[PDB]
Amino acid sequence: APQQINDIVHRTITPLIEQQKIPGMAVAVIYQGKPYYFTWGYADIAKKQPVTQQTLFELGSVSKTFTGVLGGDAIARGEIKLSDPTTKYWPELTAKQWNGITLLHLATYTAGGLPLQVPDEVKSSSDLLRFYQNWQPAWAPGTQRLYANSSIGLFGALAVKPSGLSFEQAMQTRVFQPLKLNHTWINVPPAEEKNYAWGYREGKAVHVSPGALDAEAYGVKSTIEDMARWVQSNLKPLDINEKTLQQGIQLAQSRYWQTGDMYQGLGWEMLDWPVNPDSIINGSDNKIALAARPVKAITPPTPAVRASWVHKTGATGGFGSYVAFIPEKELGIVMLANKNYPNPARVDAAWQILNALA
Amino acid sequence: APQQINDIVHRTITPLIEQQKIPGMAVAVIYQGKPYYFTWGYADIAKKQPVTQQTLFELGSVSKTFTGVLGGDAIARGEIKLSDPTTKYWPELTAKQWNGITLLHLATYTAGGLPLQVPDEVKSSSDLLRFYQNWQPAWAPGTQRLYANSSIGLFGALAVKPSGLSFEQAMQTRVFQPLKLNHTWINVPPAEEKNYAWGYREGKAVHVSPGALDAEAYGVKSTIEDMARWVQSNLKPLDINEKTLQQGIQLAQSRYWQTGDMYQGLGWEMLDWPVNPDSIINGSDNKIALAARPVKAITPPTPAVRASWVHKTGATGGFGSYVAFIPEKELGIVMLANKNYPNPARVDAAWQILNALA
Ligand SMILES: *[B]([O])([O])[C][N]C(=O)[C]C1=[C][C]=[C]S1
Numbered sequence: 091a092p093q094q095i096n097d098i099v100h101r102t103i104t105p106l107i108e109q110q111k112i113p114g115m116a117v118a119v120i121y122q123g124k125p126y127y128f129t130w131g132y133a134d135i136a137k138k139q140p141v142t143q144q145t146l147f148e149l150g151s152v153s154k155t156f157t158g159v160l161g162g163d164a165i166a167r168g169e170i171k172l173s174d175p176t177t178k179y180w181p182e183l184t185a186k187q188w189n190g191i192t193l194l195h196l197a198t199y200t201a202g203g204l205p206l207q208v209p210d211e212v213k214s215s216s217d218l219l220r221f222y223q224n225w226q227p228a229w230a231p232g233t234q235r236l237y238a239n240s241s242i243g244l245f246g247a248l249a250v251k252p253s254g255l256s257f258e259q260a261m262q263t264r265v266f267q268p269l270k271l272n273h274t275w276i277n278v279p280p281a282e283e284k285n286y287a288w289g290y291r292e293g294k295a296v297h298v299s300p301g302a303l304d305a306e307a308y309g310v311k312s313t314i315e316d317m318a319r320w321v322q323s324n325l326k327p328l329d330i331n332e333k334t335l336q337q338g339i340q341l342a343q344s345r346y347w348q349t350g351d352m353y354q355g356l357g358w359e360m361l362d363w364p365v366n367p368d369s370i371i372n373g374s375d376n377k378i379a380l381a382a383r384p385v386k387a388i389t390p391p392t393p394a395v396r397a398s399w400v401h402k403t404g405a406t407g408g409f410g411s412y413v414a415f416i417p418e419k420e421l422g423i424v425m426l427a428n429k430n431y432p433n434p435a436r437v438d439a440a441w442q443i444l445n446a447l448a
Numbered sequence: 449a450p451q452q453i454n455d456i457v458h459r460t461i462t463p464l465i466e467q468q469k470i471p472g473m474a475v476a477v478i479y480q481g482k483p484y485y486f487t488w489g490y491a492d493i494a495k496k497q498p499v500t501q502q503t504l505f506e507l508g509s510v511s512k513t514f515t516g517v518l519g520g521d522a523i524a525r526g527e528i529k530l531s532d533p534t535t536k537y538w539p540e541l542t543a544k545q546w547n548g549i550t551l552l553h554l555a556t557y558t559a560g561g562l563p564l565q566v567p568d569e570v571k572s573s574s575d576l577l578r579f580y581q582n583w584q585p586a587w588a589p590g591t592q593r594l595y596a597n598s599s600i601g602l603f604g605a606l607a608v609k610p611s612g613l614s615f616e617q618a619m620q621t622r623v624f625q626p627l628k629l630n631h632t633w634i635n636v637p638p639a640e641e642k643n644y645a646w647g648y649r650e651g652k653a654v655h656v657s658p659g660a661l662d663a664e665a666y667g668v669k670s671t672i673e674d675m676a677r678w679v680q681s682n683l684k685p686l687d688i689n690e691k692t693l694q695q696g697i698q699l700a701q702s703r704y705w706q707t708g709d710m711y712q713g714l715g716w717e718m719l720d721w722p723v724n725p726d727s728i729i730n731g732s733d734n735k736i737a738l739a740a741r742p743v744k745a746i747t748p749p750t751p752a753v754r755a756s757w758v759h760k761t762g763a764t765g766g767f768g769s770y771v772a773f774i775p776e777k778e779l780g781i782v783m784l785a786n787k788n789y790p791n792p793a794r795v796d797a798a799w800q801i802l803n804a805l806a
């Protein structure tokens with residue numbers, strides 16, 4: 091890798107790893123559209139197993155970007171429309187509060203206050219329907235953005251209904267395979283278990299546990315190499331062979347709502363570039379990222395803006411991830427770690443690196 | 449051409465020409481992506497000049513499809529956004545009725561009742577400003593569609609302002625040139641006059657008169673070969689090399705509003721395929737097409753649906769044109785005539801032809 095990239099990555103990431111006590115970490119920098127990889131520490135502390143470019147990390151919420159793109163791909167295929175009511179794809183959801191809540195609202199967290207988490211007690215499909223049927227909105231649809239797994243998680247489950255495929259099979263066949271993400275899984279098979287890193291929470295080795303709509307909201311595991319390819323694919327969608335996937339990636343970066351200097355895409359979040367660092371850094375703190383904020387509809391949505399900082403933070407109990415890229419500069423970065431350390435620390439490191447390279 | 453296309457075209461067009469007393473006509477059918485041409489009659493009755501594949505016809509309102517795509521291209525380039533207020537590009541438009549009227553409203557005839565025609569007394573740039581400043585909306589923005597040259601015409605003029613280019617130069621550079629429409633003109637050059645058909649109204653030879661916003665709303669002239677190429681480009685935008693143009697074509701086919709079973713795009717109008725023939729035929733009659741109708745917003749707009757009948761009628765005092773295509777079937781038709789004959793007759797003929805071909 092060029093000396094410029096090695097230098098800024100080393101000086102930025104190693105102190106990060108020490109300050110946050112990160113057991114293992116993998117980083118990819120996409121420079122002029124080419125990937126450069128870096129790895130440090132352990133994937134498994136007890137087994138003294140090193141993090142490699144084949145190590146699988148839990149993406150946590152960065153998984154929502156895959157859900158966003160799969161939904162975009164379903165829209166391009168004519169299977170769904172973001173303007174359609176949620177009830178069109180879930181006829182059993184008859185409760186009166188759902189009138190007016192569309193797939194768009196679900197995908198962008200603007201349904202009116204769906205909760206951050208689907209209660210841990212919701213297991214079966216029966217449980218899930220009862221949960222949504224009993225939910226009462228905090229606000230009217232399309233007025234407030236409240237980041238939620240129960241919102242985009244449902245969008246994902248409904249987005250694939252028309253195809254008749256399971257969420258996992260739709261994702262595998264419509265997204266992971268065309269893009270050749272050969273080491274990306276919602277369910278890690280036995281052959282990859284040896285590469286599945288352990289997450290660490292307060293010293294203990296842990297993996298995300300099953301939960302309702304987990305695959306849809308935070309269930310993807312991937313390597314630093316596949317994630318690099320995922321960034322290249324979102325940086326340059328026209329290079330994608332499959333027509334509906336090309337269009338889906340573009341739709342996932344359209345700006346549907348604005349809150350402050352931030353725009354909500356499908357999974358992805360975007361800001362105009364150049365961006366004010368303190369804004370994305372402080373804005374990533376959960377005290378802000380998880381709070382309700384008023385939204386102004388962008389009518390009609392602005393098509394993917396090349397001069398944008400496009401990003402998504404992600405976390406599970408024992409992992410923390412961050413992805414950011416600027417299409418106009420063919421520049422991007424992926425940071426995967428097996429410890430959920432504070433978001434601001436991730437963005438700060440990412441800004442330092444990408445700002446140095448352009 | 450295969451005898452099948454030849455037979456359906458001749459069996460449909462021959463009687464049409466006889467019943468409507470059309471002086472000259474050119475038709476192109478795009479079948480499985482290849483064009484087939486047909487011509488009849490005279491481009492100039494007095495000089496006995498026949499209609500040929502090189503004859504230029506006034507497209508009238510089919511010109512709005514070029515304006516829609518040019519606007520879409522400006523959007524893709526990040527020069528304008530459909531959600532921007534009209535005043536962002538025309539600060540001089542300070543009258544309060546303009547608050548809340550966006551470029552989307554202008555492009556889709558939903559600003560609130562802008563008139564079909566710009567008054568003949570309006571010539572000057574200051575005459576135009578005065579006209580829009582004094583105009584009083586009959587309805588709030590985005591509630592009613594009233595087909596209007598003064599609406600999409602203004603959209604076209606404003607869409608090109610950031611580029612710094614004149615509307616004609618932008619059109620030539622960004623649409624005509626990349627697509628190789630080398631015999632399509634906003635102003636017909638002297639070298640091409642020998643191929644410019646005369647329009648006929650009440651037996652008299654006529655050409656379109658200069659008017660405010662004429663280039664933007666109804667001033668393009670073209671040949672049947674160039675129009676078949678235009679249809680091919682709109683049928684398969686993904687084959688277009690120029691990134692923002694491919695995107696612009698797709699944005700022009702997005703569905704922004706719905707009235708009856710018709711959807712409004714940028715210039716183009718669309719219906720779900722299969723269509724009810726009586727619906728597009730009766731719907732083309734000016735008693736419906738030029739009428740004020742409430743519209744339902746498609747929030748967010750549906751990206752170009754492959755299973756659609758996409759079309760546009762067009763007329764000048766002496767010419768009548770029609771273009772229709774079905775992306776999913778790689779099928780299309782262009783009908784150019786030098787007599788403004790009833791819209792329903794055009795659409796009925798087009799339906800018979802395309803339906804017979806699949
Ligand atoms: B996403 O933002 O990573 C989804 N976030 C959560 O589900 C909350 C967390 C739960 C455990 C770690 S972060």
Ligand SMILES: *[B]([O])([O])[C][N]C(=O)[C]C1=[C][C]=[C]S1
Binds near residue numbers: 508510666761788
């Ligand atoms: B377009 O629909 O051709 C614009 N129509 C007009 O400007 C009105 C006229 C229709 C025929 C001659 S002028």
